[PDB]
Amino acid sequence: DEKYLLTPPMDRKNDRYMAFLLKLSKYVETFFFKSYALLDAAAVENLIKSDFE
Amino acid sequence: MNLLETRRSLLEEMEIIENAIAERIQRNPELYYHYIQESSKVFPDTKLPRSSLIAENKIYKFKKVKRKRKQIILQQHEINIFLRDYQEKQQTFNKINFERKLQQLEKELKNEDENFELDINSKKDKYALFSSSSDPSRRTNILSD
Amino acid sequence: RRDMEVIKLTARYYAKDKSIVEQMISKDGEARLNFMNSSHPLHKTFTDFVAQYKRVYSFTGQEIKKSKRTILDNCFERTQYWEFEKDKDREHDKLVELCKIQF
Amino acid sequence: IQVNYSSEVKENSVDSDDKAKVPPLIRIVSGLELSDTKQKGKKFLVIAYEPFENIAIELPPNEILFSENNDMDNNNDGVDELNKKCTFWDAISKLYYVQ
Numbered sequence: 001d002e003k004y005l006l007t008p009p010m011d012r013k014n015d016r017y018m019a020f021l022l023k024l025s026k027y028v029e030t031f032f033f034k035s036y037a038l039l040d041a042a043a044v045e046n047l048i049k050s051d052f053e
Numbered sequence: 054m055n056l057l058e059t060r061r062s063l064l065e066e067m068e069i070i071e072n073a074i075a076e077r078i079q080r081n082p083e084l085y086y087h088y089i090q091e092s093s094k095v096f097p098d099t100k101l102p103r104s105s106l107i108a109e110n111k112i113y114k115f116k117k118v119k120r121k122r123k124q125i126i127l128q129q130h131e132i133n134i135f136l137r138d139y140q141e142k143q144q145t146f147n148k149i150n151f152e153r154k155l156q157q158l159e160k161e162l163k164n165e166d167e168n169f170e171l172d173i174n175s176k177k178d179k180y181a182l183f184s185s186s187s188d189p190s191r192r193t194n195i196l197s198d
Numbered sequence: 199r200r201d202m203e204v205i206k207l208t209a210r211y212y213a214k215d216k217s218i219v220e221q222m223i224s225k226d227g228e229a230r231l232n233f234m235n236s237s238h239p240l241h242k243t244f245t246d247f248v249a250q251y252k253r254v255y256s257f258t259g260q261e262i263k264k265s266k267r268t269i270l271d272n273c274f275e276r277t278q279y280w281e282f283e284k285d286k287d288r289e290h291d292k293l294v295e296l297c298k299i300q301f
Numbered sequence: 302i303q304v305n306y307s308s309e310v311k312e313n314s315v316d317s318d319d320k321a322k323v324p325p326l327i328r329i330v331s332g333l334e335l336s337d338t339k340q341k342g343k344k345f346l347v348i349a350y351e352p353f354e355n356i357a358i359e360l361p362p363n364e365i366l367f368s369e370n371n372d373m374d375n376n377n378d379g380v381d382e383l384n385k386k387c388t389f390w391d392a393i394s395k396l397y398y399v400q
Contacts, residue, residue, distance in 0.1 A: 037133035040087035079277035113281040
């Protein structure tokens with residue numbers, strides 16, 4: 001919950017890095033919902049968004 | 054168009070779909086179990102079945118044959134589209150929900166008397182439209198029509 | 199299609215009043231509605247349709263707000279109810295046996 | 302063949318589930334054996350039902366309609382391959398069809 005934030009592979013303000021992280025994130029998410037069709041995708045999305053805010 | 058008939062057909066189709074994905078969950082409980090387990094770690098409240106059931110791949114008394122991953126996932130995506138259909142129908146339904154007229158219509162029902170044709174395709178084409186193995190001649194493809 | 203339509207129509211009206219059909223039968227006098235008597239086989243299916251329509255009258259003014267989770271749970275419970283009675287499909291070879299004996 | 306049976310005329314006195322569920326039965330008999338034993342040399346498609354009297358139909362042709370795996374080999378022998386293979390018993394109307 002803290003490592004990716006306080007012990008970053010690269011500087012979190014680096015361009016290449018942020019772009020990469022974007023692409024990867026997208027991949028992981030699509031993979032997640034892809035591998036578990038039966039769970040309500042919208043529910044999960046909203047849950048995460050509200051946790052974020 | 055009498056809305057009663059439309060809403061009826063809707064509730065009926067919904068019933069058909071529930072019955073289909075229920076038959077599926079029946080033949081291979083893993084379909085639900087798998088799903089539910091994951092759900093467990095996303096929405097903590099979710100109640101999950103007895104571990105024994107999960108392992109023995111049984112829902113009540115009968116332990117069902119274990120299926121391979123590709124099929125489990127397949128049927129899960131199929132059930133996915135089914136649930137999509139269901140959600141749609143439920144929606145339209147929510148948005149949709151004398152004697153002289155009785156004889157009035159019964160009179161027009163006399164129209165085209167010479168219609169020689171057997172009609173066994175309303176519940177059969179639907180029941181069939183959503184059942185196991187609906188593609189091949191008999192038994193080749195688990196996917197529904 | 200004709201039979202279906204008349205069954206479903208007389209079922210539509212029969213679902214609201216039950217008095218319009220009992221009047222129609224005495225007014226017209228047609229062998230068309232012969233399914234009204236429990237004698238005519240189709241009558242049974244009739245009893246179905248009406249019930250169904252009677253059901254649509256149940257939650258008129260009420261929406262169904264079932265979610266994905268719930269629908270799944272429901273289907274899983276429906277499959278468990280069908281697995282509850284699995285010791286009743288083992289009686290049919292008997293008749294065959296009788297036939298063999300008599301033949 | 303289309304064999305018709307009683308119209309609830311006499312079957313109103315016997316309804317004690319005694320083979321009442323048993324449908325009519327057909328068998329191919331050789332004329333080599335008869336109560337009189339005079340002439341013979343042909344087959345008969347005998348049809349029988351408990352109360353009513355037996356019935357026969359001569360089959361000079363050595364083979365007709367003797368098909369080859371009509372259905373997909375399902376095994377409820379009933380009485381024999383002949384009966385399941387090619388008979389229908391409209392029990393609601395009491396009409397026995399055989400072909």
